[PDB]
Design an enzyme around this catalytic site. Structure first.
Site, short mmCIF file in Angstrom:
data_model
loop_
_atom_site.label_atom_id
_atom_site.label_comp_id
_atom_site.label_asym_id
_atom_site.label_seq_id
_atom_site.Cartn_x
_atom_site.Cartn_y
_atom_site.Cartn_z
N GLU B 96 39.18 90.58 -34.92
CA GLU B 96 39.61 90.25 -33.57
C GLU B 96 40.02 88.78 -33.51
N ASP B 141 27.32 78.54 -44.76
CA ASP B 141 28.48 77.65 -44.48
C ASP B 141 28.54 77.26 -43.00
OD1 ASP B 141 30.46 76.27 -45.77
OD2 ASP B 141 31.98 77.86 -45.62
C1 UUB Z 1 48.68 69.03 -33.79
N1 UUB Z 1 48.23 70.10 -34.67
C2 UUB Z 1 47.22 69.57 -35.58
C3 UUB Z 1 49.36 70.60 -35.44
C4 UUB Z 1 49.66 72.20 -35.00
C5 UUB Z 1 48.53 72.52 -36.38
C6 UUB Z 1 47.83 73.96 -36.15
O1 UUB Z 1 46.70 73.81 -35.83
N2 UUB Z 1 48.40 75.41 -36.19
C7 UUB Z 1 47.55 76.66 -35.89
C8 UUB Z 1 46.29 76.40 -36.41
C9 UUB Z 1 45.20 77.21 -36.30
C10 UUB Z 1 45.39 78.35 -35.59
O2 UUB Z 1 44.31 79.25 -35.42
C11 UUB Z 1 43.56 78.85 -34.29
C12 UUB Z 1 42.63 77.72 -34.68
C13 UUB Z 1 41.28 77.84 -33.99
C14 UUB Z 1 40.51 79.08 -34.38
C15 UUB Z 1 41.45 80.25 -34.62
N3 UUB Z 1 40.80 81.49 -34.22
C16 UUB Z 1 40.57 82.53 -35.21
N4 UUB Z 1 40.63 83.85 -34.87
C17 UUB Z 1 40.42 84.80 -35.79
C18 UUB Z 1 40.14 84.45 -37.06
CL1 UUB Z 1 39.86 85.71 -38.29
C19 UUB Z 1 40.08 83.15 -37.41
C20 UUB Z 1 39.75 82.76 -38.86
C21 UUB Z 1 38.59 83.13 -39.44
N5 UUB Z 1 38.77 82.58 -40.66
C22 UUB Z 1 39.92 81.94 -40.83
C23 UUB Z 1 40.37 81.28 -41.96
C24 UUB Z 1 41.61 80.68 -41.91
C25 UUB Z 1 42.37 80.74 -40.74
C26 UUB Z 1 41.90 81.41 -39.61
C27 UUB Z 1 40.66 82.02 -39.63
N6 UUB Z 1 40.28 82.22 -36.51
C28 UUB Z 1 42.73 80.05 -33.79
C29 UUB Z 1 46.64 78.64 -35.00
C30 UUB Z 1 47.75 77.78 -35.11
#
Ligand code: UUB
EC number: 2.7.11.22
Lengths: 246, 322
Positions: B96, B141
């Protein structure tokens, strides 16, 4: 959400191979040669039980949507083992799966891989992932065989003998389409019921309800004895014609 | 019963343009020709892959097909290229389409979140995170660029490239270097490999501190200089507040230039007190005392947060390009 990966007994009679003319006896042989190919190639490579079964399950499911007359089995078996290795976090290089496949298949059988065996397995990975609908996670009856047998209190030697013989029955159930028929939980329960009969063991005498005969109803739910008798009959059929030793 | 992925072709989506550089392949923005719902496509190229389908993508699929939550990014389906065996083509992951990410809205300088904006945002981020930790998953992350926010005000965790399972029964070793240096907790900086889900609570603590500052609290380039900046604020690690800090590999190696005192409530007093309470409990060096994800939902700053009675933020509708 989740796809259904189980078929009736009638659904297993109209496989794509049955439609294209192949007889049930020959298809039954094509699945044994494929399962035992995946099993052996994985054993020589050091893979363990959860990886070999996963590949074999991909193999049985694959030929529910495709015919053996369109896809060589030993090629698909190698592609299933190659995918299961990456799915079960024990990946084996594609070069090692081929070097082991040629040391187990004769010139005729290895002829299914063609000129570039590795390239023929890489391409089949695309259709294999599409045939299984990217449903990679798979459970197996081994894990349930252990947990169910661990809650048993009684003779140490008897229980241990029950497990190892049922362990072999699970190794054999992978040669049939049982995985395509019942959940692994029911397979693990069935192999125990079968092992209990051949060993003449009173499994209910090792549980919490020694008076309750249906000892399994505390492990799985709503599985009549007739369903267990079906799984036992299919497993013993592999032992018919002296195909294996009990 | 049409939850069969991989069969539908990509031509059913009209690609509008690229939106970023993904892990496996470029990420595209497109609209569905059958439902008109704007989506995002994560390309997964297969041609010239030494091992075929990347195993990093296989892990993400195995996890995403188990995470159904409002706050977790949801994978709708997987579509393929045009085929027709013996052909080359890639796969596409469908998600989405969120309108914005956190790192962008704060850099944009055009946005500023009130106290009710942050409460509802942290609320959704913690509820989805508690759902992942209960499922025995570790995101590794969590950062500003991985927190997506649509124009409705709904927060979603973004990409699980570095996610893994977690054995809650018995502790087992894991991978060390996981999180970006700015959000990495100390125990990871000192070489802990049997870490708990507490590594995410720390990274989320920097997200809360970043909403009140519009700038990352900890900004360093090397792990040693990072430990220097964290200690200057949270205090120096030592057995007085962390009985197991002595067991870490780089403990005696990476010693701060001084033995600092915790002055966190001093440098973050403009923050409300309830938010400062949650911030303090989330930035405790010892992970054994660092509050779990559930314990943040029970804090005073989030216990009475009603999401239904929340007003949408002043989010720009003019995405900065296209
Ligand atoms: C002044 N300035 C600096 C120059 C003009 C440059 C630029 O900025 N162009 C552009 C950029 C960027 C864009 O985008 C927006 C941002 C915020 C968040 C988003 N949201 C979202 N939804 C769903 C999904 Cl699957 C996602 C993901 C997950 N992963 C990954 C890996 C790689 C890539 C992706 C991705 N995301 C929306 C659009 C357009």
């Amino acid at each position: 959400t989740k796809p259904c990966w189980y078929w009736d007994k009638k659904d297993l009679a109209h496989t794509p191979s049955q439609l294209e003319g192949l007889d049930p006896a020959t298809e039954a042989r094509y699945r044994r040669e494929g399962a035992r190919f995946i099993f052996d190639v994985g054993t020589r490579l050091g893979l363990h039980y959860d990886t070999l079964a996963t590949g074999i399950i991909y193999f049985h499911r694959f030929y529910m949507f495709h015919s053996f007359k369109q896809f060589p089995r030993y090629v698909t078996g190698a592609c299933c083992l190659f995918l299961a290795g990456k799915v079960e976090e024990t990946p084996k290089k594609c070069k090692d799966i081929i070097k082991t496949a040629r040391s187990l298949l004769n010139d005729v059988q290895f002829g299914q891989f063609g000129d570039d065996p590795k390239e023929e397995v890489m391409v089949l990975e695309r259709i294999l992932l599409q045939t299984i609908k990217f449903d990679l996670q798979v459970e197996h009856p081994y894990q349930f065989l252990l947990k169910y047998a661990k809650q048993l209190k009684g003779d140490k030697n008897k229980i241990q003998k029950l497990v190892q013989m049922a362990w072999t029955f699970v190794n054999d159930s992978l040669c049939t389409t049982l995985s395509l028929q019942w959940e692994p939980e029911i397979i693990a329960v069935a192999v125990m019921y079968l092992a209990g009969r051949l060993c003449k063991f009173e499994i209910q005498e090792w549980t919490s309800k020694p008076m309750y005969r249906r000892w399994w109803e505390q492990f799985v739910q709503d599985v009549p004895v007739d369903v267990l008798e079906d799984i036992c009959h299919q497993i013993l059929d592999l032992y018919s014609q002296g195909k294996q030793q009990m | 019963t049409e939850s069969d992925w991989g069969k539908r072709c990509v031509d059913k989506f009209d690609i509008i343009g690229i939106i970023g550089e993904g892990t496996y392949g470029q990420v595209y923005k497109a609209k569905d020709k059958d439902t008109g719902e704007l989506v995002a496509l994560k390309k997964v190229r297969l041609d010239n892959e030494k091992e075929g389908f990347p195993i990093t993508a296989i892990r993400e699929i195995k996890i995403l097909r188990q995470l159904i939550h409002r706050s977790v990014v949801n994978m709708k389906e997987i579509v393929t290229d045009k085929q027709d065996k013996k052909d080359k083509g890639a796969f596409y992951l469908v998600f989405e389409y969120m309108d914005h990410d956190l790192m962008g809205l704060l850099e944009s300088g055009l946005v500023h979140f009130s106290e009710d904006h942050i409460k509802s945002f942290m609320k959704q981020l913690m509820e989805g995170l508690e759902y992942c930790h209960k499922k025995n998953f570790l995101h590794r992350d969590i950062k500003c660029s991985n927190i997506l926010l649509n124009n409705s005000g709904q927060i979603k965790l973004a990409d699980f490239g570095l996610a893994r399972l977690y054995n809650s029964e018995e502790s087992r070793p894991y991978t060390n270097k996981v999180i970006t240096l700015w959000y990495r907790p100390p125990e990871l900086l000192l070489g802990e490999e049997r870490y708990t889900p507490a590594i995410d609570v720390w990274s989320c603590g920097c997200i809360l501190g970043e909403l009140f500052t519009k700038k990352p609290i900890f900004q360093a380039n090397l792990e040693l200089a990072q430990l220097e900046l964290i200690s200057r604020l949270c205090g120096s690690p030592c057995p007085a507040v962390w009985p197991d800090v002595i067991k870490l590999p780089y403990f005696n190696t990476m010693k701060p230039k001084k033995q600092y005192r915790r002055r966190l409530r001093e440098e973050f007093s403009f923050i409300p007190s309830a938010a400062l309470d949650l911030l303090d409990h989330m930035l405790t060096l010892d992970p054994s005392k660092r509050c779990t994800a559930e314990q943040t939902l029970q804090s005073d700053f989030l216990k009475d947060v009603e999401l239904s009675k929340m007003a949408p933020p002043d989010l720009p509708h003019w995405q900065d390009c296209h």
